[PDB]
Amino acid sequence: APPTLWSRVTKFGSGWGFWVSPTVFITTTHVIPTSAKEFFGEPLTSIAIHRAGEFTLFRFSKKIRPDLTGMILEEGCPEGTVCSVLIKRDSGELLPLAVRMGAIASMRIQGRLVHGQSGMLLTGANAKGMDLGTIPGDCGAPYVYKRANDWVVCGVHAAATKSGNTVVCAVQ
Amino acid sequence: PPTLWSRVTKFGSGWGFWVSPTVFITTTHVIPTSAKEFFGEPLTSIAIHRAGEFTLFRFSKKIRPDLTGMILEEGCPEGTVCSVLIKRDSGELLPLAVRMGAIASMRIQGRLVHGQSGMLLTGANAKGMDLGTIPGDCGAPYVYKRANDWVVCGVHAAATKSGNTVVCAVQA
Ligand SMILES: CC(=O)NCCc1c[nH]c2ccc(F)cc12
Ligand SMILES: CC(=O)NCCc1c[nH]c2ccc(F)cc12
């Protein structure tokens, strides 16, 4: 995956988020620190927060990441698209996990009612674990794919089943 | 625990894998042809067992005392879904699912290679995205989970231009 996409993946709350542009940051709702009143030095007042279930978009009134170009955010992807989930692990290891995407789905995963785009890992058979699968610290990692000369972001990591085979991408 | 990934080590023109503190496996063609030592041990001290494109090194002292010993087998049952544990010099980790087939002598680009055939499960193509193998990946291990037990069953020897078909060299 290109260096510019890994540069947009920022450690945030109990997981990650992703810079779409110099002013737009996307993440999974449950990783946001609940008492928090300031983000990258800016008060709530100065930020437009757009929340659709486990998807949250932050639009800043100033350029927080002026090193970046704006890229395309889409509302999920066609069923059958192979995406990479851009996961950072212990000590600059970079894990772009291959996922085949499926339908929009509503599930119950552990306690929780989860809604988003389902997909199946293409890493291995019984992927329940940090070596071939996702862990709770991965929530907010972006789902990306290459589409002609362009890369697209189409969601953020929200959940995985007890077997680890099935993942859920929160979508705008 | 040490992760599986800490066992995958840069070696020669590719990679290899620590099965135990004293046992290292790799692809024969990536081993240097001019050497007096490996991993700081004199070649005097190293047992080398070659069988076509599969090589095993047995050291006389513990090079990786942090590891436990893993199950090494001579390939796996047809239909097993393995993971090829690819490391790249970017710092990326690429576990790719492979459906394993028959032992054969296969024509792969110019070349006759003997080992276990497999097909990558990332489909359409790996062209643009982190979804296939490249020449520098030779020696990456093939692994799978069986009950609570991780099994290593061979090393990455070859792949087609296409990228669909791979060869896993196995112990003889
Ligand atoms: C992977 C990654 O985040 N890299 C950049 C780190 C960084 C430096 N200065 C910043 C200001 C805002 C922000 F969100 C990130 C940064
Ligand atoms: C233990 C075991 O047998 N696993 C399933 C084998 C398998 C993987 N990918 C497939 C795609 C089509 C198909 F017909 C079979 C497979």
- Same domain? For A91 and A166 the reply is yes
What φ, ψ does residue B9 adopt, rounded to 5°?
A: -130, 135
Output the CA torsion sign for B49, B54, B79, B69: positive
Q: Which residues of B touch A138 (CB under 8 A)?
A: none
- Matching residue, tokens 């080992």: B115
Given an 8 Å threshold on Cβ–Cβ distance, is A98 in contact with B5?
no
Indicate if B105 and B172 belong to the same structural domain.
yes
Structural method: X-ray
Q: Give the domain extent around A163.
A: 71-172
Q: B52, B69, B86 — which closes off a domain? A: B69
Work out the minimum CA distance from B60 to partner chain A, whole angstroms.
30
Eight-state DSSP code of residue B43: G
CB atoms near residue B111 (< 10 Å): 11
Q: Which ligand is nearest to the CA of A66?
A: 1
How many structural domains are present in chain A?
2
| Residue B120 · residue A98 · CB < 8 Å | no
Q: Do A106 and A39 belong to one domain?
A: no
**Residue nearest ligand 1's atom 4 by CA:** A7
Q: Tell me the C-alpha distance between A41 and B101, whole Å.
A: 56
Specified resolution (Å): 1.7
Residue of B nearest to A90 (CA): B3
Q: For residues A6-40, b (16+ Cβ closer than 10 Å) or e, as one string?
A: bebbbebbebbbbbbbbbbbbbbbbbbeeeeeebe
Say yes or no: A41 and A93 in one domain: no
